[PDB]
Design a protein around this ligand. Sequence first.
Ligand SMILES: [K+]
Ligand SMILES: [K+]
Ligand SMILES: [K+]
Ligand SMILES: [K+]
Ligand SMILES: [K+]
Ligand SMILES: [Mg+2]
Ligand SMILES: [Mg+2]
Ligand SMILES: [Mg+2]
Ligand SMILES: [Mg+2]
Ligand SMILES: [Mg+2]
Ligand SMILES: [Mg+2]
Ligand SMILES: [Mg+2]
Ligand SMILES: [Mg+2]
Ligand SMILES: [Mg+2]
Ligand SMILES: [Mg+2]
Ligand SMILES: [Mg+2]
Ligand SMILES: [Mg+2]
Ligand SMILES: [Mg+2]
Ligand SMILES: [Mg+2]
Ligand SMILES: [Mg+2]
Ligand SMILES: [Mg+2]
Ligand SMILES: [Mg+2]
Ligand SMILES: [Mg+2]
Ligand SMILES: [Mg+2]
Ligand SMILES: [Mg+2]
Ligand SMILES: [Mg+2]
Ligand SMILES: [Mg+2]
Ligand SMILES: [Mg+2]
Ligand SMILES: [Mg+2]
Lengths: 119, 88, 101, 73
Amino acid sequence: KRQVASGRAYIHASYNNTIVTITDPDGNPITWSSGGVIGYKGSRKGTPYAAQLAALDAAKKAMAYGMQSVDVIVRGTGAGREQAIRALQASGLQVKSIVDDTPVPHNGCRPKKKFRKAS
Amino acid sequence: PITKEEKQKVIQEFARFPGDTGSTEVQVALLTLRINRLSEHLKVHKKDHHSHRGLLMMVGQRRRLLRYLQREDPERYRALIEKLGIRG
Amino acid sequence: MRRYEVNIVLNPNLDQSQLALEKEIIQRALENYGARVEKVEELGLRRLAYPIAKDPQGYFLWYQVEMPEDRVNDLARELRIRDNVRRVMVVKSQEPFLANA
Amino acid sequence: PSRKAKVKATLGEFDLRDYRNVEVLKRFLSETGKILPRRRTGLSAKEQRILAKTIKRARILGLLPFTEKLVRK
RNA sequence: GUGGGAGAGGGUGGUGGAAUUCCCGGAGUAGCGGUGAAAUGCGCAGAUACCGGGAGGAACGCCGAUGGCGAAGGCAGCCACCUGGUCCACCCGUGACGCUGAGGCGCGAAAGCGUGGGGAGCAAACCGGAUUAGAUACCCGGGUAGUCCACGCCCUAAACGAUGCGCGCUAGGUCUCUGGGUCUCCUGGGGGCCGAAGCUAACGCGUUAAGCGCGCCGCCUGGGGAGUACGGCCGCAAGGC
Ligand SMILES: [K+]
Ligand SMILES: [K+]
Ligand SMILES: [K+]
Ligand SMILES: [K+]
Ligand SMILES: [K+]
Ligand SMILES: [Mg+2]
Ligand SMILES: [Mg+2]
Ligand SMILES: [Mg+2]
Ligand SMILES: [Mg+2]
Ligand SMILES: [Mg+2]
Ligand SMILES: [Mg+2]
Ligand SMILES: [Mg+2]
Ligand SMILES: [Mg+2]
Ligand SMILES: [Mg+2]
Ligand SMILES: [Mg+2]
Ligand SMILES: [Mg+2]
Ligand SMILES: [Mg+2]
Ligand SMILES: [Mg+2]
Ligand SMILES: [Mg+2]
Ligand SMILES: [Mg+2]
Ligand SMILES: [Mg+2]
Ligand SMILES: [Mg+2]
Ligand SMILES: [Mg+2]
Ligand SMILES: [Mg+2]
Ligand SMILES: [Mg+2]
Ligand SMILES: [Mg+2]
Ligand SMILES: [Mg+2]
Ligand SMILES: [Mg+2]
Ligand SMILES: [Mg+2]
């Protein structure tokens, strides 16, 4: 029980799943959800539809703390990043800003073979 | 580095006549200058190989000029080696 | 003997007694290394592009000086010893390169 | 494409070696932190190459961003 | 010689931000991860996702190139110091001092060896999960040597322009990097693309020659046996010539 009513929504999108955390203006999470939070199990988590009902699930859970206004941050590039912002768009939460914070390094670390051909 | 004052000094020193910047003596002098500088730089920084190549080249130049001088005028040669203290 | 430029970013929270303290410390450190000041421009507290030492702003002073080359590095080191000092940037002075001339 | 506006063409006569000048250097950066490519900076070989150094300098002094968050999307 | 230029050329010392990992704290709940699909794995000792603090190693996004530097190997955050090569203008000095170069000496990616540090990510071997007829493999989860540093070895390669070095001569055009001048343009130096003459078996090469010539060095002489055997030399070994 908080009565937050304003806050942040972090969409973390991968190729294997999409996951939405909804937090308070200071960044501490209020609730969250994901592909497997809802029924989904395998690859089907990284469905864009899954990301839809994940974002919606999170939104509904967030209305429970009585939230209205939310700034979005989107980290990651994957199937259903966009559809997660699109579900969130009118989830009943009204969306203030959208941002892309997706982390990229300056070539610090050596990626896995799968992710290689780069550095 | 090597400042212009240092250079002009050694040139004024080993010139054959005033105005000579080019004679074999002057050249061998300036070379000995740069060579000694580099030997000092390479006493430290022993791991710097490309500079070393440079110095190999400089040395080769010098031994060549000196060999010319000896072929030409042995007296000036003797004078030079004795003056800079070369031949090792 | 060459012309460099000393860049000093300072902590903005500074009291004047402590600020002037840091400045005269810089002075003594400059003199002690055989540097002579040519021009000085103290720009002051400006908003940075990203936190430095967790602080959102910084106090800038700039010194165009002529000093013996061999000592410069040592000097930089002295300059960084103080906690109130955040960045020290010492650049070899250059001639301004223009565009649209 | 990048036929829209060239940066040097939309600006005046400025010093390219000045890392202290902020508001000028700022216009050679992008939406995020990233230094703009030649085609959008309208600079030349040498010019670009020098801007890079002065910008990176300014970045170390904390006067220019290394990287920014992207808005909209 | 004088006056200047451009540059990831080299060595040493500083220093910056991003990311990954780990630790501390806060909030929060049932998964996360992963694939063709999965499982192993991690998670209620509270993970994943999110914010704050800290540690440690490694590498330097944009600029970034159809680019630059170096004899080659190769060189890329920023700053300073030490230092090599190189280009241009002036046409000032020396007066053939020149070229090449068997042997010698030095350098020499990666992996590898020795001693000692370091160890974040990655990762031979290995341990698991899959797929398959089997799968000592591709895929997934772990993971040691190693990768990093110092000192000392090793001397190899598609160490490739598969094109030795120097010089003289023989249409141009176009793009490009960097000097100088009378600065649309002229004139040096480098990198590309197309093409005179000519060459070439052809492909192609063509003022960056694979053209016309001269000097010097290296090398070749059907395929397999075989870069093997024997001998010598070098090496701590692996192994090299
Ligand atoms: K110079
Ligand atoms: K290239
Ligand atoms: K072993
Ligand atoms: K060969
Ligand atoms: K043998
Ligand atoms: Mg999945
Ligand atoms: Mg709505
Ligand atoms: Mg020079
Ligand atoms: Mg460099
Ligand atoms: Mg379990
Ligand atoms: Mg708990
Ligand atoms: Mg550790
Ligand atoms: Mg290469
Ligand atoms: Mg003359
Ligand atoms: Mg005469
Ligand atoms: Mg080696
Ligand atoms: Mg190695
Ligand atoms: Mg070892
Ligand atoms: Mg062993
Ligand atoms: Mg691993
Ligand atoms: Mg594996
Ligand atoms: Mg040319
Ligand atoms: Mg023809
Ligand atoms: Mg071809
Ligand atoms: Mg052609
Ligand atoms: Mg036979
Ligand atoms: Mg035979
Ligand atoms: Mg062999
Ligand atoms: Mg033996």
